[PDB]
Amino acid sequence: RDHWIHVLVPVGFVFGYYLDRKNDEKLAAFRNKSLLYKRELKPQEEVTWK
Amino acid sequence: PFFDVQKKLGVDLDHWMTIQSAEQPHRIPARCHAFEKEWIECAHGIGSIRAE
Amino acid sequence: LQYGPLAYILGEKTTKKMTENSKLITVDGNICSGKSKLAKEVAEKLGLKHFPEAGIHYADSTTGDGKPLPVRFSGNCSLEKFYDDPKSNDGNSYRLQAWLYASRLLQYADALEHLLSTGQGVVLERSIYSDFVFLEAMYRQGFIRKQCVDHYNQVKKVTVCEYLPPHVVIYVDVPVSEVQSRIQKKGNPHEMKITSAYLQDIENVYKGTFLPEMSEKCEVLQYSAWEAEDAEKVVEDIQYLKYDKGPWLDQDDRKLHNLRMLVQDKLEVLNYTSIPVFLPEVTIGAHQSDRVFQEFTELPGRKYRAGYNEDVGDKWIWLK
Amino acid sequence: MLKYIIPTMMLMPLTWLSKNSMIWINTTLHSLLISLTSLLLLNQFGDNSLNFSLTFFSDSLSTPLLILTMWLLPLMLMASQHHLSKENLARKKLFISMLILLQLFLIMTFTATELIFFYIMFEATLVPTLIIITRWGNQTERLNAGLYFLFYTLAGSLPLLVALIYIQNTMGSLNFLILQYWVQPMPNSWSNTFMWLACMMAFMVKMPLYGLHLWLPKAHVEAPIAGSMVLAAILLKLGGYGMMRITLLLNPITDFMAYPFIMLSLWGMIMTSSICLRQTDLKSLIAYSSVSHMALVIVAILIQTPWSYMGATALMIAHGLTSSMLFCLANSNYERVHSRTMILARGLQTLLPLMAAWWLLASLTNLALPPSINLIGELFVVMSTFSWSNITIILMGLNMVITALYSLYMLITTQRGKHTHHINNILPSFTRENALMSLHMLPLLLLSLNPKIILGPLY
Amino acid sequence: CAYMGLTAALVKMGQLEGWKVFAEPKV
Amino acid sequence: DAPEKNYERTMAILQIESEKAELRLKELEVRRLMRAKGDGPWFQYPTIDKALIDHSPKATPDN
Amino acid sequence: MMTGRQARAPLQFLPDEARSLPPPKLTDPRLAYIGFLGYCSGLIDNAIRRRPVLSAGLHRQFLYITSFVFVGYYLLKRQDYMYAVRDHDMFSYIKSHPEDFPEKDKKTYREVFEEFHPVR
Amino acid sequence: MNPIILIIILMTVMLGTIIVMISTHWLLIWIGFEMNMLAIIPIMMKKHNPRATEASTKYFLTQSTASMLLMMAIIINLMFSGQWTVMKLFNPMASMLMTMALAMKLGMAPFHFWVPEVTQGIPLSSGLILLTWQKLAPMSVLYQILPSINLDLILTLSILSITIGGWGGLNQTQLRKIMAYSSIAHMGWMTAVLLYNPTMTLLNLIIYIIMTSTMFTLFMANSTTTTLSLSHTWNKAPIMTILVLITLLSMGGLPPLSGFMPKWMIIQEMTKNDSIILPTLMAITALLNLYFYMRLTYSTALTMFPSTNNMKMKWQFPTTKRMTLLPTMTVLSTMLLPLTPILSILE
Amino acid sequence: ARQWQPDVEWAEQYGGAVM
Ligand SMILES: CCCCCCCCCCCCCCCCCC(=O)OC[C@H](COP(=O)([O-])OC[C@H](O)COP(=O)([O-])OC[C@H](COC(=O)CCCCCCCCCCCCCCCCC)OC(=O)CCCCCCCCCCCCCCCCC)OC(=O)CCCCCCCCCCCCCCCCC
Ligand SMILES: CCCCCCCCCCCCCCCCCC(=O)OC[C@H](COP(=O)(O)OCCN)OC(=O)CCCCCCCCCCCCCCCCC
Ligand SMILES: C=C(C)[C@H]1Cc2c(ccc3c2O[C@H]2COc4cc(OC)c(OC)cc4[C@@H]2C3=O)O1
Ligand SMILES: Nc1ncnc2c1ncn2[C@@H]1O[C@H](COP(=O)(O)O)[C@@H](O)[C@H]1O
């Protein structure tokens, strides 16, 4: 690409955002297990959040 | 650090002059062979804190 | 490195190449002694490598493309402006003298490196043992201050002890009348401004200090001008010398190995040329030092290490 | 927070692989994109803070300081690019790298979940700032400031380090989230008194405190413009942020340990404001104004009411923007007259009318003209300190006279009167300089419309 | 007048609250 | 992020950090008791190996 | 502290029981930081010998990154092993001494009296 | 010196350190120290000048007195225990004499009075060997006798070393003496945490060896032995001033550098043991050595200097000196703090 | 107008034996 330097920070954003989602799965020990938002799962659904 | 090379390689570099109860030439006992043997067999494996 | 301690371990000794022809022969004389051909004549009778006399740009001739760098990069000093105004305001006298002494130290390191690495003897012109013969002849003329002489003696004390004196010193007797005659017949308008007391002080520090101290650590051969016209008698005197003075006799492989490790490290040779003594004749300010360094980086072939410059046509740098 | 740290780090290959004429444009563009990205931190809640991971979190205290930090980098790149034009390209990239590294340290200083990671990043911010101030400060004469930095290290950050390791051994954690629920009352004892001084004096020097402000009209003077911008805008506010975190653990001993230092600030803002009436150096005048405004933040944190924390964080954001703009105006005259003397170049409204409009607006925000958030922070701190003691309004209001007095004097001396005759290099305003003044002032004016995003976690 | 008095106060409060300077190793 | 996501992520963070803080205090207490008593696998400073003793009949009987 | 533990089988960098522990992934952020230290080492190596820093010796920078990742992988395995041994000894010591770690009774805040200190 | 003989003598230095590290009998400990001293004496006399002969004589006398005190300690151990195991001692008099003798071998105060002189008289590579490799063997013996070490003696020696290493380097313009007082201060930092946690002692030893090796390798790469010759480095190689900057900032203990790593952990291991005043004043004294480091890099490394014209000759030649492990050691001496829990591999 | 740097007077304070 002739403008390959203008994608260092934006891909560096998205990858960073990617890792944030990657950490959320490591903090899902109380997904649908709190005393405030516990509920039965709707049909065609495996998790309450991702 | 005590890098225990002698036990890792299984060689006897200087364990022999270490105590009086070890194998001496011509089976010569030390004067306190029995006492040192008793104290070594007491303090073996229990650590120095429990040994004191 | 190409040469190092591993080569000394693996068998590269320098007494394996130390023949009778391995002589460091130094030819010395006044400003127009005409010895410039005589040294070359020795280099066509003994089979030795002639080194010309180190000017301002000898370091430029050793590095890069060999071409002389501009005077703001190399030297920052002028011989001809010294000939015009020897008592100048900008301090060109001792700055030129110190640059020439560092050039001679680099040339003498080159001479010992070539001698110890090839076994071929080297003929020099006015080596590091005969540079102060200008300096005191400047200082007897009041061209420089006393602090310049003290700075020069400190630099010489920390640099000349590390080396070996030459095997032979060849001195040429050309008096001040014949020097001035050859100056007027030469045709350089800057060189025709050289005075008589300066040349006489050059000759007095020759005949009274340089040769009476080199007549112990080596063997002097003092010729007049017309008998130095014949190279054959000079070479005949050289080839029948019984070398028995000086520290060349107690040179084993270890001492010459340490000397060869010294002379091949050019920054270690030039280590104490710029000693931390802030003398105004040689002190460059911080902003001018930064400016000339950033301009020397922009010179082609000088930005990186020598095998690492795409502008001059170095290939395969990514695999180096 | 890792969607902000990684673009800030990707500004390093962006600044070292950029073409030589493009390194300001690229870093300014991508740092403005990071500052636009920085608004995703406004996902705050009325009960819970925004808790990203085990390492990073953001309540409504850290979020506006993060947005101001990520906004300050493009402005510093604009402000510092003129006087680095004759600089070496590699040294210019080293300057930009130290700015990027300072932003990198700050944006994970404010989000530090645990307090010793806060300490590491907090004392990590000093090193690129030190190198920026002493390598690009245009003159360095620091014979008295070396001993003062030794005093900062002795009386400040090292007792904080020993105190935080002590809390790590006692409580078992230094997570601020855990310390919200495992906080024990810190009773009256001499051990707890030295504990309070260890937890507070580092942040007291960082604010700065009156009597401890000796570094700040030196370090602001001997610095480049980007260094003065980041000192006034962010690096003072680390002390206030750290006080608002560490005063959770210091209850209830704070309720009688605050009384000396409150006096040191309540009288101190009377003095330093008065000091601004006798300043020959304009940059020193803005420095003593920064001391005179951070004294109120010290008082508002030490009295620990809700209105005082709301006013203190609003005053921190507002004073960051305002004093950064004041240093940029001081530089926009220093780049022309080549001297910081405030009586040298006078009558500049005759020559630069739009720049004098920017001087007028920055002065009116400096003297807390309502409804600006300078006044909102000032006013809420004054209300809370009236609830603390009804006499302090005098020491508030008298300050609010003198704060007006040097604000317009700085306007009247530099911009009004007769122009200086022998100065003829006064160029018209470059579009860069006016853009810098507008990117300071227009966010500061837009925050008057919606101030609720800069009033902290207990709005 | 300053450092000697502050040090003597520190030694007094080390007597009071039990501050150990050559503390015995426990963990 | 949803308030559910932030809320439950906060609860998981708090579980991990409370477990780590309790484990740090237990680590301190375990090291204190093992240094005091010497009956654990830590602070086992060595003594003499009793396999070095010569149990042969010696030159004299009384030993 | 734990020197009586690794004295029965001395001079073992990774013991046999260390193979019961999960090894670090190759995308371990600690190991990625070690590879970044290798890249910094390659850049400093080209800087101190006046080479083009980002250009010269790409094979050399590749061996710097490779060698630091290679050493750091086993260093992280030993690190994880020693913290696992620390927790194993801790838990086995608590289990073998129930008298020293009493289950202290958990009181809710309805019985706990805390002194209220008003901010006024 | 013949390079084969140099290899043999350096292998004998290493062999003496190994014999001290691996042996179970006190006589072999003493033999390893004798071998180490006898082998290191020619490394100091490599250049054959009277300063190296003075330095080697002073080093010989200090290490010989220390070796005789070590053998007297071993002999009193034999009186009161009838055996020879390198373990805890069985008499407080043997404990005091062996702590004194190892303090003389390390150069800790009040026996510090040879370390600035000897390091000044010997070359930079032999000073590197003295300040890094010669610390390994007595720290090993102190690591193995710590059940018998008197706490008051080791803490008195430690804080005396830290104060004297702090207030001795404020006056110094010679780089080798700055490194020597830094050595004395770091040995105080290693031995004060010895009876609390010896793993942090090993951590401080390894981080110190890395930073000291970085500093002496930069000194050999620039051929600078004084402050003022170090100031003339930016006009020759600008990166070397950056590296001595970051490494001297690391040796004083700045965060977030790696040399902040040990001593912070040391404070972290001294407040567990309820010692608050001692690591406090200990790091107060470390602020003084950090403070003259910041004078010695602010006043005389950052802001660029008057140079000399002969330096413009030295622009035309690159460094052919073998800068062995210098980028690796410079990265490790600065950027290692994010890997601070690596210390568990030293347990 | 430019940046200050050490002169000879500043530099000679670090050239003696002791500081
Ligand atoms: C989110 C959307 C929001 C939309 C609404 C906008 C909200 C506020 C935005 C910012 C407002 C100020 C903008 C202009 C000032 C800065 C530039 C300047 O000096 O230009 C002079 C220049 C006119 O002068 P010139 O003759 O051409 O050349 C200059 C002269 O040589 C020399 O100059 P000069 O001496 O002849 O004249 C200077 C004069 C000097 O006049 C003064 O100094 C008098 C001002 C103080 C006393 C009067 C106001 C007291 C407070 C009451 C009013 C506020 C509350 C009202 C609400 C109801 C009651 C509570 O200043 C003015 O006339 C400025 C008028 C506005 C002043 C606002 C208050 C500033 C005082 C300090 C802070 C006070 C508290 C905070 C106020 C916050 C308001 C929201 O203006 C322009 O060329 C306009 C440029 C474009 C302006 C765009 C504004 C919006 C920017 C935001 C962008 C993002 C959102 C998108 C919205 C876009 C809308 C188009
Ligand atoms: C628990 C403990 C177990 C054991 C752990 C391991 C401990 C490691 C301690 C390392 C001590 C290294 C001492 C120095 C190296 C030994 C040999 C030597 O001196 O080599 C230098 C050599 C001398 O050559 P020469 O010709 O005399 O130089 C004069 C200049 N014309 O050549 C030169 O002068 C060339 C210039 C560069 C030399 C750099 C040498 C760096 C060596 C240190 C590497 C870092 C330490 C290892 C990693 C950490 C280990 C703790
Ligand atoms: C001469 C030496 C050894 C040191 C001391 C010193 C410098 C360089 C720069 C400065 C300095 O003194 C400090 C004093 O106090 C602060 C406090 C600061 O923050 C707390 C702060 O932040 C940038 C800056 C400053 C001074 C500052 O600019 O080198
Ligand atoms: N102080 C000095 N005065 C004049 N010439 C000098 C001085 N120092 C060195 N030289 C050199 O000596 C040369 C004279 O030798 P020649 O080659 O015989 O002309 C001059 O051309 C200079 O290059």
Q: How far apart are CA D342 and CA D410, in angstroms?
A: 8
CB-based contact D302:D262 (threshold 8 Å): yes
Output the ligand 3 site: residues, CB below 6 A.
D 126, 129-130, 133-134, 142, 145-146, 148-149, 152, 205-206, 215, 219, 231; H 294-295, 298
**Residues in chain I within 8 Å Cβ distance of H297:** none
Q: How far apart are CA D177 and CA F14, in angstroms?
A: 7
Query: D366 alpha carbon to ligand 1 midpoint, in Å?
Result: 16
Query: C274 alpha carbon to ligand 3 midpoint, in Å?
Result: 33
Q: Is C295 helix (H, G, I), strand (E, B) or coil?
A: helix
Method for structure elucidation: cryo-EM
Query: D406 alpha carbon to ligand 1 midpoint, in Å?
Result: 23
- Bridge partners (DSSP) of residue C172 are C223
Could you tell me if G75 lies within 8 Å of chain H, comparing CB atoms? yes
Sign for the pseudo-dihedral over CA of C84, C86, C90, C93: positive
Structure token digits, residue H290: 């950090």
State the DSSP string of D325-368: HHHHHHHHHHHHHS--BTTTS--TTTT-HHHHHHHHHHHHHHTT
* Paired sense of beta strands H307-308 and C283-284, if any: antiparallel
Give the alpha-carbon dihedral of D224, D225, D230, D232, to 10 degrees: 110
Helices A8-24 & D2-16, crossing angle to 10 degrees? 160
Q: Which atom of ligand 3 is nearest to the CA of D214?
A: 15
Distance from the H49 Cα atom to the nearest Cα atom in chain I, whole angstroms: 19
Q: Where are the beta strands (DSSP E) in chain C?
A: 24-28, 49-50, 122-125, 168-173, 219-224, 283-284
CB-based contact H307:C284 (threshold 8 Å): yes
Residue position matching structure tokens 């101001």: D68
Contact B2 H28 (CB under 8 A): no
Residues 6+ apart with CB under 8 A from C291: none
Domain ranges in chain A are 1-50
Could you tell me if F13 lies within 8 Å of chain E, comparing CB atoms? no
- Judged by CB atoms within 8 Å, which residues 1-27 of E form the interface with H? 10, 14, 19-27
State the DSSP string of C249-275: TT--HHHHHHHHHHHT-HHHHTTTTS-
**Residues in chain G within 8 Å Cβ distance of C319:** 57-59
Contact F45 H85 (CB under 8 A): no
CB-based contact B17:B25 (threshold 8 Å): no
Touch test D–B: 3 Cβ pairs or more under 8 Å: no
Distance from the A17 Cα atom to the nearest Cα atom in chain D, whole angstroms: 5
Q: In terms of Cα–Cα distance, which of C171, C278, C289, C271 is closest to C225?
A: C171
Contact H88 F45 (CB under 8 A): yes
Q: Find the closest chain F residue to B34 by CA distance.
A: F63
Give the alpha-carbon dihedral of D46, D52, D54, D56, to 10 degrees: -90
- Among partner residues H25, H88, H143, which is closest to B17 by beta-carbon distance? H25
Q: Is C169 helix (H, G, I), strand (E, B) or coil?
A: strand
Contact I14 H299 (CB under 8 A): yes
Q: How far apart are CA H14 and CA H20, in angstroms?
A: 10
H47 lines ligand 2 (CB under 6 A): no
- Bridge partners (DSSP) of residue C221 are C170
Q: How far apart are CA H199 and CA H343, in angstroms?
A: 7
Q: In terms of Cα–Cα distance, which of H49, H52, H43 is closest to H120?
A: H52
Domain ranges in chain D are 1-459
Q: Find the closest chain G residue to F28 by CA distance.
A: G90
Residue position matching structure tokens 């002496």: H216
Q: How many helices (H) and strands (E) would you count in chain B?
A: 3, 0
Query: G113 alpha carbon to ligand 3 midpoint, in Å?
Result: 48
Sign for the pseudo-dihedral over CA of H153, H154, H155, H161: positive
Angle at D369 between CA D363 and CA D371, to 5 degrees: 135
Q: Which atom of ligand 1 is nearest to the CA of D358?
A: 19
Task: Give start and end residues of each alpha helix (H) in chain F.
Answer: 3-37
Q: How far apart are CA C245 and CA H250, in angstroms?
A: 54
CB-based contact F48:B41 (threshold 8 Å): no
Maximum CA pair distance of chain E? 39
